[PDB]
């Protein structure tokens, strides 16, 4: 069979330029790549938060080190997401926060420290799980950098950056490596009688042909949904939010520091992200139009940050869900054209480079063997539905009951069998997926991470943070007092590391400044 | 001169039964009224939306309160029309909606709040005009009722109802009051040598005579057009749509609520109405056959609502325009026999009862003084052409350029001198017609409303919603800082009212249910 020679990517947002760059790198020879993007249709870039696989799967693949791309996108550091006011109905006299940290919780004799922590909690231990089981949360409270001043990494972390700048950076990178860029707008898509894409007709009268089409057109799914008619599976029965109101808010970094984490601040009818970088933070109130109006939600977002009726706002709507199939015939959807999940756990850009990784892993020839696309499609469904369930578990496990929105989340959601099963194991006191890999191994082994994306520590951060704990500690521990004492020594080491970080790390603001404004 | 004694109405649709009922009520003595309607020729009833004068001019005249007629027609509430995707080319990531609300915008020192809002917008104020100037749009977003649970009206509103049921209700009402109903079909119309209608010959061999004939035969204009040869002024040079594909779509009211407004959803080659009531919504894609085929437009309508190729559809065509004269000799046209304008601003049923009001105001004797019919005809021309221009202003002011249809609307329409003049005043920053009347006064003074049917607030809802704003705020305001501060207090009161409505109104679904399924 003839190899794919010509590839056309529709879309110049983060997805299209990630696609262009990943494919140009992956396809060393024989491929001609063209990207068409409209000057008239804006990209989606709100201020974006990411996870460690961005470097390991995406930039490392391109051969671009962190120090090369970070400054060009005004990158900042992200060590966690901090959930605020999620646990029960907010009270301004009470500090309700918890962290979801990157990285694996250590095991002690085959049992994760989360489980020894729970046994202590049964005996009256007061410290929250993540402060007991991870060395870094107090450092995040102190707004400390993830690295020593000399750049030596001290905790697993990822990035916050200007999403437009990321698209721009990759545009430059891809074009320089032979990617053909066309600034124009696709107006019609012709299919042959068999249902394959023949060509794209553009506003300026260009006819684009290719062996392979990558739909990066964003939520409109110009090829996959509109031309190819692939059903979008609306998952608004699983998750209620459908809207965001977003802006950048200036930050007084010299006075207030730069928080080395994304915050998720539960609101009345959704939650507000906060994504700090030097000089400002991206923020957006993700809300459900069924429970609040855009105008009301806008009042709230402005009130939250003391912002004026004059502050210009990025008003957004979205459909939650995914295509029935991500790749149909000769078209692969990547990015917002493929699926969307609210940004509660920073999975959006992950879905782009994870899908691209899988595309290259299942790369077709011009015959388009359906066995390849079937296998690819199955990977995408696992990836998405697994993240959807994880996000949904933040909502159905909450103890908040103060608004219609929170009550709906507690009572009215449709839950997959898979998430019910995980919750059941957790409640029984069983660990979820654990590994004896350290973080380096995990984050360097994407075939492992892709299929084991949420580990025991991830579930525990969320469920413990939200105040849903197992019915009991692991029965096995009752037989293992030596192991319990071994775990005590491990908790002691974590505390020692935390105290060392406290006095060793520069502030995030100082470190970012030393990398340079 | 001898009074009119015998009246024959041809047609049993909404127009004929409104005519029968209005005339039987108006003509207390000396009139004998017969209505002939064919069992073989269907009525036009799609699911219909109305305006407040329906109660004030029509049902109040009959002496029928809202609570008497509403339940019998499965009525629902309408507080606005919500225009979706009209402002620029649709993007599924963007919420493009605006409301056209019933009721007058308040004045502050002789200047409408729309104009203070514009001055704020010049200074960076971000809130849309209708959310600033009216207390109810956020309540409509929350699908709230127009009344408190005890029925106390909280905003100006009108109705959605089953149009067949309305015709049926009035049929029963009119017949009970002495209207003679004949189920038969007129097959020939005899004119005397002078051109007056002598008689109607029917299929069953009846010969109908009368002093006065009311043509309610619908678009065929059996008497006015076909027998009397009155020219129809085709206005397809002003407005491009000529077709609709319509259906009822089931609604999940318990899950999704019942929207207390009509929606106008701009499509590729026209727009789709949505008219909610309990259990379902009437919908129709109004389109231009010049830009799309009925088959294509049907695909779109089905796609819009996720409907099946098995869904039976009300396929419609129409001519836009009006007779050169509505009343000729002894025949008065009322309803679709007189004129048609696409339902963009819910004027169709208005044209019926407004025309009937004017008929009674110009009521003839058997001599048919042409001074009476001339005066009546002039009122009808003003009424129609004024609404035509208002509707047309939705089309020529749009910024959409994504289809041939939208481009034609921006560039290819013939505009009246009257509408050019209004647009010019608006662009100069001048208010259009304002009144210091409150809504109660306006809607109780039909001689005022009939001649001042679109006020400043109506034009501003549409032009601001579509994104065409004046070149500048009113120069006068530069001299009136105290007035500007007074307006601020008024905007503050509106916001307070909006927040009170948010927590005080029942949902529209709940309220309608309490009135009863
Ligand atoms: C509210 C919100 C918050 C988010 N937060 C995060 C986060 O914190 N972290 C994270 O990782 N991800 C986040 N995401 C996801 C992230 O923004 C997207 O995954 C990412 O930016 C890629 O978008 P995209 O390129 O698929 O689509 P878009 O940005 O919508 O780009 C679409 C491109 O296609 C072009 N186009 C469309 N139609 C045509 C046509 N007819 N002809 C030519 N060009 C066309 C447009 O011009 C544009 O270039 C968030 C998303 C949303 C909506
Ligand atoms: C697509 C569309 C959407 C609309 N939407 C709205 C809206 O949202 N709101 C609104 O207020 N209005 C709306 N209208 C207008 C509204 O439907 C009409 O104004 C109204 O229902 C009255 O119609 P009619 O009685 O004039 O004619 P028809 O309903 O066509 O009735 C004609 C009557 O005359 C009879 N007839 C015809 N010829 C003969 C004959 N030879 N002998 C005996 N009987 C005869 C028929 O049997 C029938 O009884 C819309 C109209 C259309 C076409
Ligand atoms: N395996 C992913 C899990 C993840 C996604 N979003 C997160 C946010 C916070 C912590 C972990 C995550 C990671 O460690 O990167
Ligand atoms: N004077 C009419 C104007 C009107 C017609 N159709 C409308 C639709 C929405 C708002 C106002 C209107 C009214 O207030 O009833
Ligand atoms: Cl995300
Ligand atoms: Cl109408």
From Swiss-Prot, chains A, B:
Swiss-Prot/TrEMBL catalytic activity: L-tryptophan + FADH2 + chloride + O2 = 7-chloro-L-tryptophan + FAD + 2 H2O
Role played: Involved in the biosynthesis of the antifungal antibiotic pyrrolnitrin. Catalyzes the chlorination of tryptophan (Trp) at C7 position to yield 7-chloro-L-tryptophan (7-CLT).
Protein name: Tryptophan 7-halogenase PrnA
Result, substituting residue 78 to A: Loss of halogenase activity
Additional remarks: The reaction between FADH(2), Cl(-) and O(2) produces hypochlorous acid (HOCl), a powerful oxidant. Unlike the mechanism proposed for the tryptophan 7-halogenase RebH (AC Q8KHZ8), which suggests the formation of a chloramine intermediate with a conserved lysine, HOCl is proposed to be a direct halogenation reagent, with the conserved lysine that may hydrogen bond to HOCl to enhance the electrophilicity of the chlorine species and for its correct positioning for incorporation into the 7-position.
Disruption phenotype: Cells lacking this gene lose the ability to produce pyrrolnitrin.
Keyword Flavoprotein listed: yes
Transport is among the record's keywords: no
Pathway listed: Antibiotic biosynthesis
Residues given in the record as chloride binding sites: 347-348
Upper lineage: Bacteria, Pseudomonadati, Pseudomonadota, Gammaproteobacteria, Pseudomonadales
Effect of residue 273 to A: No change in halogenase activity
A single GO BP: antibiotic biosynthetic process
